[PDB]
Structures are given as C-alpha cells and as structure tokens.
Design an enzyme around this catalytic site. Structure first.
Site, PDB file in Angstrom:
ATOM      1  N   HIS A  49       1.753   1.624  -5.600  1.00  0.00           N
ATOM      2  CA  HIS A  49       0.234   1.138  -5.677  1.00  0.00           C
ATOM      3  C   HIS A  49      -0.486   2.271  -6.186  1.00  0.00           C
ATOM      4  O   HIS A  49      -1.437   2.109  -6.836  1.00  0.00           O
ATOM      5  CB  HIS A  49      -0.306   0.821  -4.475  1.00  0.00           C
ATOM      6  CG  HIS A  49      -1.689   0.421  -4.337  1.00  0.00           C
ATOM      7  ND1 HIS A  49      -2.156  -0.680  -5.341  1.00  0.00           N
ATOM      8  CD2 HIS A  49      -2.488   0.833  -3.596  1.00  0.00           C
ATOM      9  CE1 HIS A  49      -3.494  -0.928  -4.877  1.00  0.00           C
ATOM     10  NE2 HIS A  49      -3.554   0.143  -3.815  1.00  0.00           N
ATOM     11  N   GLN A  81      -5.369 -17.431  -3.451  1.00  0.00           N
ATOM     12  CA  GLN A  81      -5.718 -16.431  -4.841  1.00  0.00           C
ATOM     13  C   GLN A  81      -6.786 -17.101  -5.634  1.00  0.00           C
ATOM     14  O   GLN A  81      -7.566 -16.326  -6.048  1.00  0.00           O
ATOM     15  CB  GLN A  81      -4.297 -16.725  -5.561  1.00  0.00           C
ATOM     16  CG  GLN A  81      -3.107 -15.819  -4.759  1.00  0.00           C
ATOM     17  CD  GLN A  81      -3.540 -14.383  -4.884  1.00  0.00           C
ATOM     18  OE1 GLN A  81      -3.704 -13.715  -5.920  1.00  0.00           O
ATOM     19  NE2 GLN A  81      -3.195 -13.762  -3.844  1.00  0.00           N
ATOM     20  N   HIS A 113       0.673  -1.162   0.102  1.00  0.00           N
ATOM     21  CA  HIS A 113       0.023  -0.036   0.063  1.00  0.00           C
ATOM     22  C   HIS A 113       0.805   1.154  -0.117  1.00  0.00           C
ATOM     23  O   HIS A 113       0.708   2.188   0.868  1.00  0.00           O
ATOM     24  CB  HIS A 113      -0.937   0.109   1.389  1.00  0.00           C
ATOM     25  CG  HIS A 113      -2.224  -1.012   1.115  1.00  0.00           C
ATOM     26  ND1 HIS A 113      -2.239  -2.162   1.671  1.00  0.00           N
ATOM     27  CD2 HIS A 113      -3.118  -0.696   0.410  1.00  0.00           C
ATOM     28  CE1 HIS A 113      -3.301  -2.968   1.386  1.00  0.00           C
ATOM     29  NE2 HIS A 113      -4.037  -1.994   0.708  1.00  0.00           N
TER      30      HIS A 113
HETATM   31  C1  0T7 Z   1      -6.725  -6.194   1.151  1.00  0.00           C
HETATM   32  C2  0T7 Z   1      -6.139  -6.143  -0.434  1.00  0.00           C
HETATM   33  C3  0T7 Z   1      -7.041  -6.389  -1.620  1.00  0.00           C
HETATM   34  C4  0T7 Z   1      -6.133  -7.062  -2.672  1.00  0.00           C
HETATM   35  N1  0T7 Z   1      -5.708  -6.198  -3.576  1.00  0.00           N
HETATM   36  C5  0T7 Z   1      -5.163  -7.276  -4.507  1.00  0.00           C
HETATM   37  C6  0T7 Z   1      -4.741  -6.732  -5.709  1.00  0.00           C
HETATM   38  C7  0T7 Z   1      -5.173  -8.528  -4.301  1.00  0.00           C
HETATM   39  C8  0T7 Z   1      -4.850  -9.983  -4.437  1.00  0.00           C
HETATM   40  C9  0T7 Z   1      -4.060  -9.941  -5.653  1.00  0.00           C
HETATM   41  N2  0T7 Z   1      -5.230 -10.920  -3.657  1.00  0.00           N
HETATM   42  C10 0T7 Z   1      -5.691 -10.797  -2.484  1.00  0.00           C
HETATM   43  C11 0T7 Z   1      -6.031 -11.947  -1.841  1.00  0.00           C
HETATM   44  C12 0T7 Z   1      -6.699 -12.049  -0.565  1.00  0.00           C
HETATM   45  O1  0T7 Z   1      -6.690 -13.001   0.056  1.00  0.00           O
HETATM   46  C13 0T7 Z   1      -6.899 -14.324  -0.677  1.00  0.00           C
HETATM   47  C14 0T7 Z   1      -6.494 -15.585   0.299  1.00  0.00           C
HETATM   48  C15 0T7 Z   1      -7.568 -15.842   1.149  1.00  0.00           C
HETATM   49  C16 0T7 Z   1      -7.156 -16.972   1.984  1.00  0.00           C
HETATM   50  C17 0T7 Z   1      -5.949 -17.267   2.326  1.00  0.00           C
HETATM   51  C18 0T7 Z   1      -5.404 -18.389   3.159  1.00  0.00           C
HETATM   52  C19 0T7 Z   1      -4.172 -18.588   3.357  1.00  0.00           C
HETATM   53  C20 0T7 Z   1      -3.148 -18.022   2.549  1.00  0.00           C
HETATM   54  C21 0T7 Z   1      -3.473 -17.194   1.622  1.00  0.00           C
HETATM   55  C22 0T7 Z   1      -4.720 -16.597   1.459  1.00  0.00           C
HETATM   56  N3  0T7 Z   1      -5.258 -15.611   0.545  1.00  0.00           N
HETATM   57  C23 0T7 Z   1      -7.225 -10.552  -0.336  1.00  0.00           C
HETATM   58  C24 0T7 Z   1      -6.893  -9.671  -0.895  1.00  0.00           C
HETATM   59  C25 0T7 Z   1      -6.207  -9.664  -2.032  1.00  0.00           C
HETATM   60  N4  0T7 Z   1      -5.911  -8.350  -2.736  1.00  0.00           N
HETATM   61 MG    MG Z   2      -7.292   1.078   0.399  1.00  0.00          MG
HETATM   62 ZN    ZN Z   3      -5.674   0.375  -2.784  1.00  0.00          ZN
END
Ligand code: 0T7
Ligand code: MG
Ligand code: ZN
Length: 322
Positions: free
Chosen positions: A82, A279, A78
């Site tokens: 970004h 992901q 962030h």
């Molecule tokens: C808060 C930022 C929002 C955001 N912008 C981008 C651009 C992404 C991108 C590219 N990926 C994001 C993946 C996320 O969570 C996925 C997730 C869920 C459960 C998990 C459990 C274990 C390990 C990893 C995990 N990832 C959450 C937010 C993600 N994100």
């Molecule tokens: Mg934000």
């Molecule tokens: Zn943002």
C-alpha cells in the site's frame, strides 16, 4: 521500533531498475504488484528522478526506506505494498505537474506517501475512538494519521536515518509541516470538507496556488487521490485489492463481535452480498468526486478519473449479475 539491518540498506544501494520498468513507472495505472523485491528500489528511483540524485544522502535514504518497510505490519491491506502504491501515484501526479510544486514539496510529498500508514494495525479511527486503546486518548481526532506522523519522525530520529538534516532549519521545519498536513489529509473524514472547499474555490475562480491555505488543500486532495489509487488500476488489480481491504474490514468486525458489539455491514463478513453496492456508493460519493475535482485543478491527472470511471462501470456490471 524496528530498524533495518546492515545487509538490507546496502543491498538497496546496489539495486538498479530494468529499462522496461523505467518507461511503465511513468504511467498513472502502473501496478507495482508483480515487482515486490524491487519495491524499495522503485521508490529510490522515483525520489532520484523527481527530486534529484543530489537530493538526499544515499546511505541515509536507504536506511530510512528499509526501516520504513520494517515498520509496516503484515496486515492484508494497510501494508508496505500500500505505501509504495501510494508513493507511486504521487510520483505520477508530480511528474505530470512538476513545476507547480517546489523541490521541498516534492521531497516531502513522496516521503509522506511512503510513511502515511506507518505501523497501521488494520483498525479504523472509528474502532479506536469507540473502544480504547490509548491511541484515541493520545489523539482524539485523525488519530491513526497522527500516529503515522509520530512514527515518521521517530524513524527520522534513528541513527543515520535523518534524510532531511542537510536542509537548513527553515526548510527542515517546513518539510516536516508539509509531511504533517499531507499525512493528516489522508484521514478520509477530512476529505469531504476539503473537496467541497476546493470545488467552491475552483467554480468561483477563487483558486490560487500562491495562497498557502489553498495550496495546503490541493496537496491534501492529491493525498486522497493517491491513497485511493487502487480504484484507478486495471479492473483485475482493483478487484484483487478490494479483497485485501475487505479482509481487514471483516477482521475488525470480528474483534468487535468478540467484544459484544455489532459491526456495520461494511465490516460484517456475513454481509458479503452488499459489497458491490457498497463499492458503487463509495465510487459515487468518494472516488468519482475526488478524481473529478482533481482533474479540474490538475488537468494532466485526468487518466486517474478515467480509470475510476472504468472501474465504477465494472462494479455496475457486477451488481446486475454480468
Ligand atoms: C478505509 C480505507 C479507504 C479506502 N481506500 C480504498 C482504496 C477503498 C476502496 C476501494 N473501497 C472502500 C470501500 C468502503 O466502504 C464501502 C462499503 C460501504 C458499505 C458496505 C456494506 C456492506 C458491504 C460492503 C460495504 N462497503 C470504505 C473504504 C474504502 N476504501
Ligand atoms: Mg491511513
Ligand atoms: Zn492509506
């Protein structure tokens, strides 16, 4: 609050953009990554191109941008990179849908994207509301995003920084509203409702851009699309960006551990193995639907959907070991 030097905004005034960059900036999948020194000048260029050279007073603009830059922290994701990433995606959507949007809106949306994560700490709204930290008491919902807007106005309030002063009070108050709604829309907790409404309005054919609330909802989804746009780059850029994001998530998890709270797997660095599945779930539940509905409302934005489909394909490839 950090203020740019005299040496920074004047140097920005001097900056010009190379010819080959002018062409590539127009591409949705363009990666600002390799051009760090040029990032401030890239935004100026985008603003001049989209809104006009007569739009803002150059000196006021340069101060504003370089002071926005100094109010982004040295966090893994962030950060300033970004901010410009998100502004560029906005520029691409706007260039491909130019006349659908007013002068004021294009000004507001570009500036909103640049400022939309101002003074981010690397901590989520979940963290702050479940700890405290005064920000969660100051803003019960939407929370960092309300703080980002507060910072946006603060920087405008710096001497010689108010780029919107030459506007009439009517247009001035409007542009702030545009910026406010747009920044708030970047809280992903709101995206899910927003996209359902838009889906509902499109499928039934209720959707009308002359209707302000409808227009507000379209802007917010554009904000979501831009905020998420690292999922729409070439795979190696997307994969590198994913590292940065997880660097922040895990660091938040680590502070939670220090204070005797178990973090969710997403913020748990011991749960590294679950990333590709996490992901996949994010693409399926968030990114894919975002860029789909966006392509429906704004057909020119389809290359965004395509790149996200491609990256989903890549994550699937990682899951099955390839
Ligand atoms: C808060 C930022 C929002 C955001 N912008 C981008 C651009 C992404 C991108 C590219 N990926 C994001 C993946 C996320 O969570 C996925 C997730 C869920 C459960 C998990 C459990 C274990 C390990 C990893 C995990 N990832 C959450 C937010 C993600 N994100
Ligand atoms: Mg934000
Ligand atoms: Zn943002």
């Amino acid at each position: 609050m950090s203020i740019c030097t005299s040496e920074e905004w004047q140097g920005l005034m001097q900056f010009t953009l190379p010819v080959r960059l002018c062409k590539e900036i127009e591409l949705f999948h363009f990666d600002i990554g390799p051009f760090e020194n040029m990032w401030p000048g890239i935004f100026v260029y985008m603003v001049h191109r989209s809104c006009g050279t007569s739009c803002f007073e150059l000196e006021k603009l340069c101060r504003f941008i370089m002071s926005v830059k100094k109010n982004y922290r040295r966090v893994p994701y962030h950060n300033w990179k970004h901010a410009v990433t998100v502004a560029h995606c906005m520029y691409a959507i706007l260039q491909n849908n130019h006349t659908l949007f007013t002068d004021l809106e294009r000004k507001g949306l570009l500036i909103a994207c640049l400022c939309h994560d101002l003074d981010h700490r690397g901590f989520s709204n979940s963290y702050l509301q479940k700890f405290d930290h005064p920000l969660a008491a100051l803003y019960s919902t939407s929370t960092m995003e309300q703080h980002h807007f507060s910072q946006t106005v603060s920087i405008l309030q710096l001497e010689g920084h108010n780029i919107f002063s030459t506007l009439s009070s009517s247009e001035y108050e409007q542009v702030l509203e545009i910026i406010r709604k747009a920044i708030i829309a970047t809280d992903l907790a709101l995206y899910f409702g927003n996209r359902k409404q838009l889906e509902e309005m499109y499928q039934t054919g209720s959707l009308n851009l002359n209707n302000q609330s409808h227009r507000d909802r379209v802007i917010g989804l554009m904000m979501t699309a831009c905020d998420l746009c690292s999922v729409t780059k070439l795979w190696p850029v997307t994969k590198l960006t994913a590292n940065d994001i997880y660097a922040e998530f895990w660091a938040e998890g680590d502070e939670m551990k220090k204070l005797g709270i178990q973090p969710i797997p997403m913020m748990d660095r011991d749960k590294k193995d679950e990333v590709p599945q996490g992901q996949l779930g994010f693409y399926n539940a968030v990114a894919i639907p975002c860029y789909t509905t966006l392509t429906q409302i704004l057909p020119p934005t389809e290359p965004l959907l395509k790149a996200c489909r491609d990256n989903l394909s890549q994550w699937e490839k990682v899951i099955r070991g390839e």
